[PDB]
Each structure stands twice: as C-alpha cells, then as structure tokens.
Amino acid sequence: APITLWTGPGPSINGFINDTPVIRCFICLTRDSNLVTVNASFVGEGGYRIVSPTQSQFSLIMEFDQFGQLMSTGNINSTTTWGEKPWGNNTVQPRPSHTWKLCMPNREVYSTPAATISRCGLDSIAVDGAPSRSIDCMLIINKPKGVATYTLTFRFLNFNRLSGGTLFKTDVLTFTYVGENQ
Amino acid sequence: APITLWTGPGPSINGFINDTPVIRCFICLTRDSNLVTVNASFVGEGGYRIVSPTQSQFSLIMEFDQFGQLMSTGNINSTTTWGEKPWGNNTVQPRPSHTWKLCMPNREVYSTPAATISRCGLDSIAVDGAPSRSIDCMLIINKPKGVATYTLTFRFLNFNRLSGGTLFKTDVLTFTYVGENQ
Amino acid sequence: APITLWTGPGPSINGFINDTPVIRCFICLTRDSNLVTVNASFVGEGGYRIVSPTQSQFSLIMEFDQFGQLMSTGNINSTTTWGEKPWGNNTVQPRPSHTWKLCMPNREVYSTPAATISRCGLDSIAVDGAPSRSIDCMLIINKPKGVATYTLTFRFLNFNRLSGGTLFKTDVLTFTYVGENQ
C-alpha cells in the first residue's frame, strides 16, 4: 500500500540552524507503488525572515533510523510533529508502523549519496517570479550523519544569485527517489 | 482510489485571454494516494503562436467549486472539454463524482496562496534546448478569485529571457501539490 | 495495477555511443494510476568520466515495441539488464507481462513528440551545487526512430554552460508523462 509521512499542515518553527528554531518546514513524503515524492515548503522567521545575497548556504537534515523513524538529532527532528497522514484527513499519527520504512530512500539504490539540485523561488508571487529572486535547494539522499540509517537533506544554496534582501518564503518544492523495500 | 481529471488529448483552443481563445492547453490532474500531479503543455495560436522578448506576462486561471468542479469563469473553464479520464481509455467523462474533490489543492495545506516557478522550455526539440529559448511558468495554488473554492493558475513569465522570437510550444510541465480529503 | 520497469541498482556500463559502452545508466519507469514517472541517473566512464565545456552533445535513446518490450537497437537496450521490479525487492524480472505497455508514453497523447528540458547538476555534492556545474538533460518522448513504437530519449545538452571539466556524475533526474492504456 501507499503511505505518507509528514509534518502536518501549519508547522511550528521546526527547522533548527545550530540549535535555534528559525524556519517553518512543511515536509511531506508520499510513497506510492515504488517511488517516494518529497513535497516541501519553507518559511523563515526571525533572523531568517529575510535572507541577504551574502547568506551562507545551509542544510536542514532529517535523520531516520533503520525502521524509518525520525530521530531527535537532525535539524528537523522528532521534537516537533511528524508522523503518518491517514487517507481522508489532515492529522499526524505519530505512532510508528513497519510501513514507515517504505518512505525511506532505498539503501541499495542509494548506497552512496545522491542529490538533486533544483530551483528554489523565493517570495515568488510578490516578486512576480523575478529571475534574481531564486536560490537553489538541493536534496541530498543518504549523506551519512551520526548513526542515522537514512538521511534526507534540504540544502539551500547560491544565495548570491539574489539581487537583494528577499523574504525566505520558498516555493513548493518537489523531489523524487526510489523507496525502500519492506 | 486514484482519479484523473483532464482536457483529453488534442485539446481545442481552450485558453482564453481577453475573452479570446488563444492557447491550446493540455492539462491533466492525476490524484494518486495523497499528492496530485499536474501534467500540462501549451501551444499558442494566432497572435500567441510566436512569443518574443517583448511579450507581456499572462495568467490562465482555472476556478473550481467546493466539489472540485471546474467553473465557467476562468481562463481555462468549463465551456471546453473537461472531465474524468477512465483507466484504460482516452475519453473525457463529464458527469461529476464525489471523487473529483480529491484532485483539488488541500485548503489546510494551501490556506494561503502557494507557488512553484519552474523553467518552461519552448520549441525545445526544434531549437535543441538552446538555453535562451526558455521562459518560466509559475503555478499558483489557491490565489483568491470570485466565488472559487480552489484555483490553479499557470502564469507565463520572463519572456525577456528569450534571445528572440520562439514558437510558444511548451515542454511538458509537471507540478505537485497535496490533494484535498474526501 | 501499478508497474515498474528498471535497470536495477548498480547498473553495468549500459549506455552505448557508437557501439562502445561509456555511461552507466540507472533508469526507472514507474507507472501509477495514470502517469509514468521517469527516475534516472548517469555516471560516465572512460572517455566520458569527465566532461568539458566543449563536449559534443549526444542522445541516449531507448526503443520499445508495441507491447512495451525494450528493443536491442537503442543506446540503452535489451542486451543489458532490464525488466520489472517486484514490489518488495530489488530484482529485475525479465518475464514480460501485459502490464509492461502501461509504462509506455500514451500514443494518442504523444502522437507528436513531446519534450521536457531540465537542469542536470553534475557532481553536485562535491561542488556544493555551484551554478556553473550544471548541464541540461532533455527527455524526448516518442521522437520517431526506425521501427520502434515508443521511444524515450535522454539528450544531454549545453555542456558549454560548464565553467570547466566536471565529473559526469548526474543528479537524480525526474520526468513525467501520461501512460499508455492497456
């Protein structure tokens, strides 16, 4: 069967940069028959409300154990809401099932780290998609971190593409990878 | 269950600008377990056959009611072919089902307008993907309009990226969003 | 039902240019209810290990018969591993099925060839996504070739975007098209 893991809608400030909560992350991992679709969006708060062209690139890493459970140690972690989305409602069901492994990046296919770098428009409606208002966001798959069995990294890059200070309100971002076997 | 709503193959000139039919829009919304995939392509006609660096940006809005039924008042609307694609054939079934809501952009997740701006190659096979032969297409999700409960807007932008006149024959465009609950 | 055709993990050097194996191609075609997702990645070998700004553009074409069986005559072809992925493991099953047609690009929808040109990051983790380390990969759908019923072409373009020599280790690339009817 399919399975979706997600933050739920209306996330708290659940993305930490060096132990400070600064980004609201909506993250959805939907496993259909074989592939997992990552659907995500991010909103900066406080000192990340607006990002400058000189902003250092940074990763938001999700660490998962061998059962596909989110660990407490990443930048997006089990201290904030995360769990299964039941078909038919918008709840987060936090009690893990064996099925959660199906949302993880297949260890054999991604036995070394893989990546997808894509455009990440910022404040796109308000700036009417101006070319110099996009950065990049690179998904890194299974780059090692601590004792995590699986990792998903959202790495925001190339802020120097920006013509000036820009609201850190990302587009909806999509990535795809091969799901793990049960 | 999954459900697809689409224009069918070989659409008529069904994209209206200033109440004039000027673009042939192929649009498919496929809901699988949780996410909806937008798969779309566009061909300009008449004064929109060729676009150039002097072309002004424009939007094609689809308006849907609370049941996921396409309304008559958008730029792409219920006055042209639109409905469900049966698994196993290429017909368009016009009679609404409860299931059509499942193709809609989830109103909790998209409680304010969301966007994805992406490259939109033009005439890409013919021009062999020359870098200066792309524009952008931004999908806007749930921009408020009229009495619509849901909206999808295809906004064509950044014609100034083009090196010159180019056939408005878009790549196959893909976007993804979280589906509404039954 | 859904169905996935793929090369399996850790593919051999299975991309041929002038009858010489030069690229390792991971290719996955996953059909869900209606759409097919192409998930692919490439690693150059030998003379293709490093690519330069002056690299000759080239295509890797897959040719399929009317039943969705991969033919022997494309650049990626039936002389190497290819077949169905069972749900639950990473094997490659050679036994054809009626379902394999469902991975093919819908002949009526793509009676004229379609394309999607997208960014193709190279060596992206190592170069931390530097903008000048991307090329383009265009998927061409049903560009006619010989006696094939369906074709998928991966055309690698715009090497002249590169700032210098770069390891031909692509990002995970994703494309989407409407699947064929049984």
XYZ file of C-alpha atoms in Angstrom:
546
model
C 0.000 0.000 0.000
C 0.878 3.661 -0.182
C 1.989 5.558 2.922
C 2.558 9.232 3.634
C 4.731 10.685 6.383
C 4.538 14.408 7.057
C 4.820 17.323 9.477
C 1.121 18.074 9.125
C -0.137 21.414 7.882
C 0.756 24.713 9.590
C 4.119 23.643 11.005
C 5.642 25.194 14.123
C 9.113 26.714 13.837
C 10.641 23.234 13.424
C 13.807 23.818 11.367
C 16.830 24.491 13.569
C 20.034 26.206 12.495
C 22.702 25.444 15.122
C 20.155 24.914 17.846
C 17.937 27.946 17.105
C 14.446 27.415 15.644
C 14.397 29.695 12.576
C 12.460 28.003 9.722
C 8.905 26.627 9.486
C 9.169 23.435 7.392
C 6.229 21.724 5.727
C 7.548 18.331 4.662
C 5.550 15.506 3.049
C 6.985 12.116 1.943
C 4.439 10.190 -0.106
C 5.264 6.633 -1.121
C 3.093 5.258 -3.899
C 3.864 1.928 -5.550
C 7.667 2.335 -5.903
C 8.781 5.935 -5.737
C 8.677 8.439 -2.932
C 7.695 12.016 -3.733
C 9.071 14.710 -1.454
C 6.805 17.745 -1.330
C 8.096 20.614 0.830
C 7.999 24.318 1.562
C 9.818 26.595 3.990
C 9.192 29.935 5.663
C 11.962 31.748 7.522
C 11.330 33.517 10.789
C 13.304 35.927 12.951
C 16.779 36.403 11.524
C 15.848 34.189 8.579
C 12.621 36.079 7.767
C 14.600 37.937 5.083
C 17.710 36.437 3.513
C 20.540 38.529 2.060
C 22.627 37.692 -1.033
C 25.620 37.074 1.292
C 23.756 34.403 3.278
C 25.795 31.257 3.923
C 24.378 28.084 2.432
C 22.945 25.673 4.995
C 21.486 22.218 5.275
C 18.367 21.028 7.083
C 18.986 17.346 7.764
C 16.382 14.748 8.706
C 17.864 11.648 10.318
C 15.934 8.365 10.313
C 16.683 5.043 11.982
C 16.556 1.605 10.243
C 12.777 1.439 10.716
C 12.134 4.816 9.070
C 11.556 6.616 12.374
C 12.605 10.263 12.564
C 15.420 10.744 15.083
C 15.859 13.558 17.628
C 19.306 14.579 16.298
C 18.693 16.277 12.931
C 17.851 19.910 12.127
C 14.260 18.757 11.556
C 13.625 16.182 14.226
C 11.271 14.203 16.446
C 10.892 17.053 18.969
C 8.276 18.579 16.600
C 5.292 16.924 14.948
C 5.945 14.121 12.488
C 4.026 11.022 11.541
C 1.669 9.295 9.197
C -1.083 11.103 7.258
C -4.220 8.977 7.246
C -6.070 8.900 3.944
C -9.076 11.203 4.373
C -7.889 13.650 6.993
C -5.145 16.141 7.859
C -3.923 14.593 11.125
C -0.419 13.423 12.070
C -0.388 9.929 13.512
C 2.899 9.745 15.471
C 2.906 6.025 16.396
C 5.298 4.187 14.018
C 4.352 1.322 11.751
C 6.601 -1.127 9.932
C 5.213 0.530 6.790
C 7.134 3.758 7.532
C 10.274 2.150 6.113
C 8.609 2.383 2.692
C 9.098 6.149 2.698
C 12.861 5.826 3.168
C 15.451 6.115 0.379
C 16.287 2.597 -0.841
C 19.640 1.679 0.750
C 20.827 -0.425 -2.200
C 19.907 2.121 -4.835
C 21.418 4.923 -2.697
C 24.343 3.049 -1.201
C 26.357 6.217 -1.771
C 24.887 9.710 -1.503
C 22.674 11.001 -4.324
C 21.477 14.521 -4.984
C 19.044 16.647 -6.981
C 19.678 20.391 -7.229
C 16.726 22.447 -8.298
C 15.495 25.956 -8.422
C 14.008 27.376 -5.282
C 11.981 30.515 -5.973
C 11.595 32.901 -3.019
C 8.561 35.160 -2.446
C 7.533 34.303 -5.987
C 4.022 35.737 -6.102
C 5.014 39.067 -4.525
C 8.117 39.497 -6.726
C 6.317 38.078 -9.762
C 8.912 35.364 -10.326
C 11.786 37.796 -10.985
C 14.769 35.693 -12.142
C 17.063 37.206 -9.463
C 14.692 36.134 -6.647
C 15.514 32.415 -6.862
C 18.096 30.420 -4.977
C 18.697 26.661 -5.215
C 17.628 23.813 -2.965
C 19.496 20.545 -3.284
C 18.038 17.371 -1.846
C 20.838 15.109 -0.657
C 19.903 11.488 -0.118
C 21.747 9.312 2.428
C 24.732 11.529 3.143
C 25.973 9.967 6.358
C 25.289 11.646 9.698
C 25.958 10.128 13.120
C 24.223 6.767 13.476
C 21.298 7.517 11.074
C 20.429 4.698 8.664
C 18.726 7.114 6.222
C 19.053 10.835 5.737
C 17.264 13.476 3.727
C 18.932 16.863 3.475
C 17.417 20.073 2.161
C 20.456 22.237 1.291
C 19.761 25.830 0.419
C 22.464 27.221 -1.854
C 23.522 30.079 -4.111
C 22.003 32.964 -2.169
C 24.426 35.172 -4.105
C 22.043 34.713 -7.083
C 19.673 37.124 -5.255
C 19.596 40.760 -6.341
C 18.986 41.828 -2.721
C 17.244 41.026 0.575
C 14.380 38.626 -0.107
C 11.617 37.167 2.065
C 12.576 33.488 2.715
C 9.196 32.163 1.636
C 10.013 29.257 -0.668
C 8.073 27.820 -3.498
C 6.546 24.372 -3.145
C 9.470 22.088 -3.912
C 9.248 18.522 -5.265
C 11.841 15.726 -5.432
C 11.616 12.018 -6.178
C 13.561 8.907 -5.171
C 13.231 5.127 -5.144
C 11.546 3.882 -1.939
C 12.970 1.251 0.356
C 11.581 -2.283 0.337
C 9.555 -3.546 3.270
C -8.953 5.490 -5.080
C -6.953 7.399 -7.687
C -8.663 9.829 -10.027
C -7.628 11.841 -13.088
C -9.350 14.978 -14.448
C -8.141 16.210 -17.836
C -8.856 18.026 -21.077
C -8.317 14.823 -23.087
C -5.829 14.561 -25.948
C -5.832 17.115 -28.805
C -7.494 19.972 -26.903
C -9.335 22.772 -28.676
C -8.164 26.349 -28.372
C -9.325 26.449 -24.743
C -7.142 29.068 -23.059
C -8.821 32.448 -23.199
C -7.103 35.823 -22.829
C -9.279 38.951 -23.081
C -12.217 36.630 -23.790
C -10.436 35.391 -26.954
C -9.333 31.731 -27.435
C -5.556 31.904 -27.995
C -3.830 28.865 -26.452
C -4.363 25.119 -26.741
C -3.971 23.787 -23.209
C -3.435 20.113 -22.448
C -3.998 19.757 -18.705
C -4.105 16.597 -16.618
C -4.601 16.464 -12.831
C -3.820 12.975 -11.514
C -4.502 12.174 -7.869
C -2.796 9.081 -6.535
C -2.721 8.182 -2.832
C -2.024 11.664 -1.431
C -0.483 14.017 -3.983
C -1.857 15.449 -7.163
C 0.447 15.706 -10.173
C -0.258 18.451 -12.679
C 0.945 17.427 -16.138
C 0.446 20.196 -18.727
C 1.570 21.524 -22.058
C 0.544 24.552 -24.115
C 0.576 25.610 -27.765
C -0.074 29.243 -28.721
C -2.312 30.117 -31.665
C -2.754 33.242 -33.760
C -1.007 36.210 -32.138
C 0.334 33.826 -29.473
C 1.903 31.346 -31.923
C 5.225 33.198 -31.653
C 6.369 34.823 -28.431
C 9.354 37.156 -28.191
C 11.258 39.235 -25.632
C 8.644 41.991 -25.916
C 5.819 39.640 -24.832
C 3.932 40.627 -21.692
C 3.367 38.081 -18.973
C -0.058 36.472 -18.701
C -2.022 34.094 -16.490
C -4.504 31.306 -17.235
C -6.659 30.619 -14.165
C -8.762 27.511 -13.539
C -11.534 28.029 -10.934
C -13.128 25.087 -9.116
C -16.072 24.948 -6.741
C -16.183 23.195 -3.354
C -16.815 19.842 -5.076
C -13.822 20.103 -7.421
C -15.971 21.053 -10.419
C -14.421 23.357 -12.981
C -16.247 26.697 -13.199
C -17.152 28.705 -16.289
C -15.391 31.941 -15.260
C -11.609 31.266 -15.512
C -9.297 31.490 -18.494
C -9.498 27.706 -18.734
C -13.038 26.803 -17.949
C -15.987 24.516 -18.097
C -17.070 25.743 -21.534
C -14.475 23.470 -23.172
C -13.751 19.696 -22.819
C -13.040 18.755 -19.203
C -13.699 15.724 -17.013
C -12.590 12.383 -15.686
C -10.244 10.049 -17.546
C -11.286 6.441 -17.158
C -8.485 3.978 -16.507
C -7.940 2.159 -19.833
C -9.065 4.735 -22.395
C -8.607 8.353 -23.519
C -12.190 9.565 -23.145
C -13.360 12.528 -21.049
C -16.289 11.752 -18.738
C -18.164 14.970 -17.926
C -20.503 13.854 -15.100
C -19.157 14.879 -11.644
C -18.368 12.479 -8.828
C -17.632 12.989 -5.149
C -14.112 11.798 -6.037
C -13.319 14.943 -8.052
C -12.610 16.873 -4.837
C -9.538 14.625 -4.446
C -7.824 16.417 -7.370
C -8.142 19.757 -5.574
C -5.359 21.565 -3.662
C -5.835 20.816 0.054
C -7.220 24.002 1.731
C -5.486 23.396 5.099
C -2.124 22.970 3.483
C -2.779 25.783 0.973
C -4.640 28.114 3.288
C -2.710 30.976 1.711
C -1.572 31.136 -1.938
C 1.375 28.872 -2.790
C 3.576 28.834 -5.890
C 6.123 26.874 -7.848
C 8.122 28.753 -10.513
C 9.884 26.496 -12.998
C 11.673 26.618 -16.303
C 9.408 26.308 -19.319
C 11.325 25.260 -22.435
C 9.843 26.462 -25.722
C 10.051 24.551 -29.006
C 12.742 22.527 -27.299
C 13.153 19.670 -29.788
C 13.403 22.068 -32.775
C 15.742 24.571 -31.126
C 17.685 21.729 -29.443
C 17.130 23.117 -25.938
C 19.124 26.315 -26.535
C 19.407 27.992 -23.098
C 17.926 31.300 -24.369
C 14.757 29.583 -25.687
C 13.134 29.043 -22.288
C 10.723 31.191 -20.311
C 9.237 30.450 -16.862
C 5.870 29.025 -15.919
C 4.735 29.592 -12.347
C 1.890 27.511 -10.973
C -0.038 29.458 -8.332
C -2.243 27.422 -5.991
C -5.388 28.940 -4.430
C -4.975 32.524 -5.489
C -8.354 34.003 -4.467
C -10.840 34.580 -7.303
C -14.580 35.273 -7.410
C -16.543 32.514 -5.654
C -13.943 29.822 -6.367
C -13.092 27.460 -3.527
C -9.896 26.292 -5.314
C -7.797 27.760 -8.082
C -4.830 26.728 -10.214
C -3.121 29.484 -12.221
C -0.480 28.955 -14.933
C 1.413 32.232 -15.170
C 3.858 32.611 -18.072
C 6.711 34.928 -17.143
C 10.168 36.192 -18.060
C 9.780 36.367 -21.806
C 12.736 38.778 -21.572
C 14.935 35.671 -21.052
C 14.376 34.763 -24.702
C 17.019 35.586 -27.275
C 14.349 36.163 -29.902
C 11.034 35.052 -31.372
C 10.211 31.495 -30.443
C 7.268 29.223 -31.091
C 5.055 29.040 -27.998
C 5.175 25.253 -27.915
C 5.896 24.439 -24.288
C 7.638 21.484 -22.794
C 5.605 19.023 -20.798
C 5.368 20.793 -17.414
C 4.941 18.984 -14.082
C 3.865 20.366 -10.736
C 2.849 18.606 -7.497
C 0.638 19.506 -4.542
C -1.121 17.822 -1.635
C -4.617 16.632 -2.547
C -7.795 17.550 -0.746
C -9.530 14.977 1.513
C -12.860 13.366 0.584
C -2.332 -2.020 -11.214
C 0.989 -0.137 -10.948
C 4.127 -1.422 -12.619
C 7.833 -0.523 -12.600
C 10.419 -1.326 -15.278
C 14.040 -0.629 -14.470
C 17.716 -1.432 -14.858
C 18.075 -2.474 -11.219
C 20.542 -0.855 -8.807
C 24.234 -0.675 -9.699
C 23.777 -0.947 -13.456
C 26.574 -2.081 -15.740
C 28.065 0.229 -18.356
C 24.856 0.029 -20.356
C 24.793 3.322 -22.310
C 26.466 2.845 -25.679
C 27.745 5.527 -28.035
C 28.904 4.148 -31.403
C 28.686 0.605 -30.009
C 31.076 1.422 -27.145
C 29.826 1.202 -23.541
C 30.560 4.615 -21.996
C 27.838 5.521 -19.461
C 26.298 3.705 -16.501
C 22.553 4.426 -16.688
C 20.161 3.916 -13.804
C 16.682 4.126 -15.337
C 13.358 3.525 -13.591
C 9.907 3.844 -15.187
C 7.154 3.676 -12.589
C 3.544 3.694 -13.707
C 1.000 4.545 -11.041
C -2.707 5.115 -11.804
C -2.264 7.275 -14.921
C 1.165 8.910 -15.115
C 4.593 7.377 -15.550
C 7.478 8.843 -13.563
C 10.952 8.533 -15.085
C 13.634 8.477 -12.403
C 17.182 8.325 -13.796
C 20.829 8.990 -13.109
C 24.025 8.588 -15.080
C 27.729 8.093 -14.430
C 30.273 8.486 -17.224
C 33.099 6.043 -17.658
C 36.323 6.052 -19.618
C 36.442 8.987 -22.021
C 33.122 10.100 -20.505
C 34.295 10.110 -16.886
C 34.985 13.842 -17.083
C 33.065 16.132 -19.425
C 34.226 19.524 -20.528
C 32.627 22.721 -21.782
C 33.444 21.687 -25.386
C 31.823 18.226 -25.085
C 29.731 17.142 -28.049
C 26.048 16.957 -27.161
C 24.527 13.500 -27.541
C 21.435 11.354 -27.019
C 20.815 8.025 -25.346
C 17.695 6.548 -26.945
C 15.565 3.684 -25.602
C 13.387 1.917 -28.232
C 10.289 -0.092 -27.251
C 7.956 -2.279 -29.348
C 4.135 -2.090 -29.251
C 3.973 -4.225 -26.101
C 6.483 -2.083 -24.183
C 9.400 -4.501 -24.609
C 12.781 -2.777 -24.794
C 14.386 -3.345 -28.183
C 18.022 -4.204 -28.940
C 18.760 -1.212 -31.186
C 18.784 1.847 -28.895
C 21.746 3.263 -26.986
C 20.212 1.715 -23.876
C 18.880 -1.645 -24.920
C 17.828 -5.204 -24.241
C 21.403 -6.572 -24.308
C 21.789 -5.354 -20.708
C 19.747 -5.775 -17.530
C 16.172 -4.533 -17.825
C 12.842 -5.751 -16.563
C 10.197 -5.441 -13.926
C 10.834 -4.518 -10.281
C 8.745 -6.619 -7.952
C 7.249 -4.786 -5.016
C 9.335 -5.766 -2.034
C 12.748 -6.407 -3.576
C 15.454 -5.006 -5.885
C 15.458 -7.761 -8.518
C 14.988 -7.251 -12.241
C 12.432 -9.664 -13.718
C 12.774 -10.490 -17.469
C 9.400 -12.251 -17.834
C 7.263 -9.821 -19.875
C 3.666 -9.023 -18.960
C 0.593 -7.331 -20.451
C 1.251 -4.643 -17.824
C 4.561 -3.525 -19.384
C 2.677 -1.492 -22.025
C 1.437 0.678 -19.160
C 4.902 2.213 -18.770
C 4.942 3.475 -22.342
C 4.112 7.061 -23.338
C 0.466 7.215 -24.439
C 0.472 7.049 -28.251
C -2.563 9.286 -28.737
C -1.357 11.941 -26.275
C 2.145 11.870 -27.811
C 1.284 11.380 -31.476
C 3.576 14.367 -31.974
C 6.797 14.189 -29.964
C 6.957 15.928 -26.568
C 9.903 17.088 -24.518
C 10.963 18.367 -21.109
C 14.323 20.062 -20.765
C 15.544 20.277 -17.209
C 18.645 21.135 -15.251
C 21.135 18.296 -14.810
C 23.523 19.013 -11.918
C 26.916 17.321 -12.206
C 28.959 16.192 -9.220
C 26.652 18.321 -7.175
C 27.536 17.226 -3.638
C 31.298 17.617 -4.243
C 30.940 21.024 -5.936
C 28.230 22.102 -3.451
C 25.801 22.889 -6.266
C 27.876 25.607 -7.915
C 25.675 27.139 -10.641
C 28.308 26.620 -13.380
C 28.433 22.857 -12.717
C 25.075 22.046 -14.341
C 24.219 20.912 -17.851
C 20.758 20.189 -19.236
C 19.112 16.799 -19.867
C 16.097 16.847 -22.149
C 13.713 13.904 -22.190
C 12.187 13.500 -25.661
C 9.010 11.416 -25.739
C 8.143 9.398 -28.901
C 10.617 11.055 -31.261
C 10.324 8.549 -34.123
C 13.203 6.111 -34.593
C 13.325 3.226 -37.082
C 10.662 0.638 -36.320
C 10.127 1.474 -32.644
C 6.557 2.039 -31.401
C 7.663 4.095 -28.375
C 10.906 5.920 -27.641
C 12.442 7.708 -24.703
C 15.475 9.852 -25.445
C 17.828 11.333 -22.854
C 19.609 14.157 -24.645
C 22.484 15.790 -22.824
C 22.847 19.437 -23.798
C 24.577 22.684 -23.024
C 27.891 21.363 -21.791
C 29.096 24.849 -22.732
C 27.317 26.081 -19.533
C 30.096 24.389 -17.526
C 32.886 26.558 -16.128
C 35.384 23.725 -16.714
C 35.918 19.971 -16.578
C 33.360 18.238 -14.366
C 32.846 14.619 -13.285
C 29.904 13.250 -15.340
C 28.039 12.100 -12.222
C 24.498 13.340 -12.655
C 21.865 14.270 -10.187
C 18.811 12.084 -9.806
C 16.585 13.339 -12.657
C 12.819 13.040 -12.792
C 10.360 13.371 -15.682
C 6.634 12.628 -16.054
C 4.359 11.635 -18.907
C 0.852 10.220 -19.448
C 0.942 6.409 -19.602
C -0.434 4.166 -22.321
C -3.747 2.362 -21.932
C -3.822 -1.435 -21.559
